[PDB]
Amino acid sequence: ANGTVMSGSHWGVFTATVENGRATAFTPWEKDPHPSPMLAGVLDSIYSPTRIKYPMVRREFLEKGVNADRSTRGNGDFVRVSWDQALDLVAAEVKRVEETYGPEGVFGGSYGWKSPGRLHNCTTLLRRMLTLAGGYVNGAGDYSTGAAQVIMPHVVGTLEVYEQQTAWPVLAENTEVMVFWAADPIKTSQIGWVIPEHGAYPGLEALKAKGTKVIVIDPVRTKTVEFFGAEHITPKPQTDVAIMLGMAHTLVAEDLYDKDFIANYTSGFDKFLPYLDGETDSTPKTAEWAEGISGVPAETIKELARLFESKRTMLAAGWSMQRMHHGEQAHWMLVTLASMLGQIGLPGGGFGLSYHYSGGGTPSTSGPALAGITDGGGASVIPVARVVDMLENPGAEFDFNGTRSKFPDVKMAYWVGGNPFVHHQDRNRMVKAWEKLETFVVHDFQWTPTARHADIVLPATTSYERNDIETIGDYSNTGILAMKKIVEPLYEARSDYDIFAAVAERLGKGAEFTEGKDEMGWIKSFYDDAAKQGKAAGVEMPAFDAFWAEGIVEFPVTDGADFVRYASFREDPLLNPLGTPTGLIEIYSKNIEKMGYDDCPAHPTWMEPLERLDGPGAKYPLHIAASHPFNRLHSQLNGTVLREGYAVQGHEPCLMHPDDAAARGIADGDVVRVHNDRGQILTGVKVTDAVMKGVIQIYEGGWYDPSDVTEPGTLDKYGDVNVLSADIGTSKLAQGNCGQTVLAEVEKYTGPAVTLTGFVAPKAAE
Ligand SMILES: NC1=NC(=O)C2=N[C@H]3C(S)=C(S)[C@@H](COP(=O)(O)OP(=O)(O)OC[C@H]4O[C@@H](n5cnc6c(=O)[nH]c(N)nc65)[C@H](O)[C@@H]4O)O[C@H]3NC2=N1
Ligand SMILES: NC1=NC(=O)C2=N[C@H]3C(S)=C(S)[C@@H](COP(=O)(O)OP(=O)(O)OC[C@H]4O[C@@H](n5cnc6c(=O)[nH]c(N)nc65)[C@H](O)[C@@H]4O)O[C@H]3NC2=N1
């Protein structure tokens, strides 16, 4: 092959140059307003040294099965086998666990970002196969908004976090003050769950062009601060709820708040006020009290409050601040403050929880929705971040949103499209708990830490080696794209669909899994359903072969540019109620009161977390801002040429303030040891005043590279920040992860020299 083909990914729509059957360049779509620089690593990931070539079986597992020594998982001692031998083995283990232990013995949650595509959806295909096998245990919720997605339904009656926002053009005309609270939209808008349209960049440009006042509340001076030249407030991490309380107190004491919005559209403020004023605990939540906890000057807190009440203000909040202990309080308190300001439902005012993710706010079109392949459908479901608790405590009870259940006794886990050996918290705890599993099977196209720890590893293909169909724009529904095959499958890789169809055949359910269709048969069935709906809806669409030839169909915008969140509620609350018990915004919740949880009271409350910067009696001195990477999508693309632009002496970078480096005798470029009571990792330092003093930045997603897998607490040589995090729930209400509640110490490294081993394939898979 020679020529150009159009396809897409989590980073955008692109055109590939193909020279003699090798892809040589990926060029952005000409209609993409702001392409991501990561595209070059996407191309590289097809061919890099960590591409998985053949099916492999861990030697100890091949030789002894259930009696293998499970403490050597991760050491790289693999044996190459034929596909027929691998598929027979996988089918035999699925059958054995289902027959001996039941559906409760198989964990199939398989959390992960995978790749877009309606047919080649590896995690849905995994559940489709396991359902035909007898069943499995599944996961509930996600690692992004684990706390916020449970508390919003109790407060505003809807999910809220993954719903369309007041449109960007409406903000440009009406907003006077734009606040980015714990959000860095310049960094996080580069990717989409489905294909991204990068709709936030023109939206942010328009705010800057109109001269709107922008305020950023974040411990790091990010690209969003720089882009706008914004006013920047730097709180100590995990203290945002205290600042919010101090603002609320100020509005009450100066008699500025909207008493009519409070009286007519909310419920429970009378129960919250005594707490705010200090009647219940002798502690008035003043701006001065708030300064003592957060470090932000009391006069600044009062001035911000006054400004927000007197101008049309939009509170745009990100999700880092609820990915922490007691994380439910942050967005519950933000909605309470927004109710006191009284602008919810007005054009350009109120709050928004998705302006930093997947285009939220880009005007929606009138096109039809596209559907894909389905899954065919102790506890049968657990909160996703309780996976290690589950393995350590089979049969024990756990609390979750008002209900009590028991953990299932799992013996096998099957993971595709995810990297738990990078994404889950407390790596050393996790490594020890994984010994409880008899069998661990993984599919991926790259040799991640998760692939290196499996018993059986099967090489998948990338999206660039097959055909598929997907929507452009999670919220905008801009159009539908043909994700055309670019190169033939490499080495001995197969799509997840083909792997699962062959396992299903072996369990005698081959026809139920494929439904008699092939790749193009399935894709046309999804496209005809969307074209039929479109017709009902008056939206014209071509026939499938003609759509495939063009490669894309775009839809028209009708009234999408005028959408204003909460306008009909504001217009008449009795006629357009919220989904809560009272029909109003619940500041005090009687349902949460009845649950009786000590770590989630019935109104927003300041509570001390497990550990925080400058907390009374804190052991470690620095907070780690363990946030999302600028030049990776989580762990994706770490094993590519992009690593060279950011690694420091080959390690993952650590940003540190000049005063904190000087006290430790550390210089820019030094290799350092970052440690606490849970673990120890190596990173390379970059000295900068971009991080506030007392905070260090190490992004999540680095590929864990242990020195010796049989040594408890072994040093990670590359820089996986989850070796340092604690694995606990946000509270009994949501049970979300706390991946950003982390303190540690840093010292110059003085041990033996080290050789990095995570970016080349295991010797036997070469
Ligand atoms: N380039 C890129 N890479 C990705 O991996 C990526 N992941 C996607 C995913 S799945 C999601 S879930 C979203 C995540 O979007 P999310 O809002 O959770 O992003 P983070 O990078 O964890 O945090 C954003 C900001 O919060 C600041 N921050 C941290 N702690 C605090 C605090 O206590 N208080 C305050 N006020 N600020 C704090 C950080 O410094 C950071 O600038 O991004 C998505 N987009 C992504 N883009
Ligand atoms: N400390 C900390 N702070 C955080 O802010 C934080 N963020 C959390 C969040 S919000 C999330 S969403 C998780 C992300 O954790 P997640 O496991 O989703 O991360 P990825 O690096 O996207 O792993 C995706 C894997 O799927 C593989 N893959 C892609 N396409 C295919 C395919 O078609 N077939 C197969 N078989 N494999 C494929 C990729 O190669 C990659 O290895 O991290 C969480 N972890 C976090 N920890």
- What's the number of extended β-strand segments? 29
Largest sheet: 6 strands, mixed
By CATH, the superfamily of the largest domain comes out as Dimethylsulfoxide Reductase, domain 2
- Taking strands numbered 1, 2, ... along the chain, how are they ordered across the largest sheet? 5-4-19-18-17-6
Q: Strand content of the residues, in percent?
A: 15-25%
Tertiary shape: globular
Radius of gyration: 26 Å
CATH class of the largest domain: Alpha Beta
Distance between the termini: 26 Å
Cofactor: Mo-bis(molybdopterin guanine dinucleotide)
Organism: Rhodobacter capsulatus (Rhodopseudomonas capsulata)
InterPro entries: Asp_de-COase-like_dom_sf, BisC, CT_DMSOR/BSOR/TMAOR, Molybdopterin_N, MoPterin_dinucl-bd_dom, Mopterin_OxRdtase, Mopterin_OxRdtase_prok_CS, Prok_Mopterin_Oxidored
Subcellular location: Periplasm
General description of the model:
The protein is 29% helix and 17% strand. A hairpin with a 2-residue loop joins β15 and β16. The protein has 766 residues and is α/β, with parallel strands linked by helices. The radius of gyration is 26 Å and the shape is globular. 52% of the residues are buried. It contains 26 helices and 29 strands. The protein has four domains: 51-142 and 375-466 and 492-514, Rossmann fold (3-Layer(aba) Sandwich); 144-363 and 564-589, Dimethylsulfoxide Reductase, domain 2 (3-Layer(aba) Sandwich), CATH 3.40.228; 2-29 and 467-484 and 515-555, Dimethylsulfoxide Reductase, domain 3 (Alpha-Beta Complex); 597-759, Barwin-like endoglucanases (Beta Barrel). Strands 5-4-19-18-17-6 form a six-stranded mixed β-sheet. The chain has a six-stranded mixed β-sheet with strand order 25-27-26-29-24-28. The protein binds ligand PGD (2 copies). The site of one ligand PGD has 35 residues, from β18. It comes from Rhodobacter capsulatus. Its main location: periplasm. Keywords: Metal-binding, Molybdenum, Oxidoreductase, Periplasm, Signal.
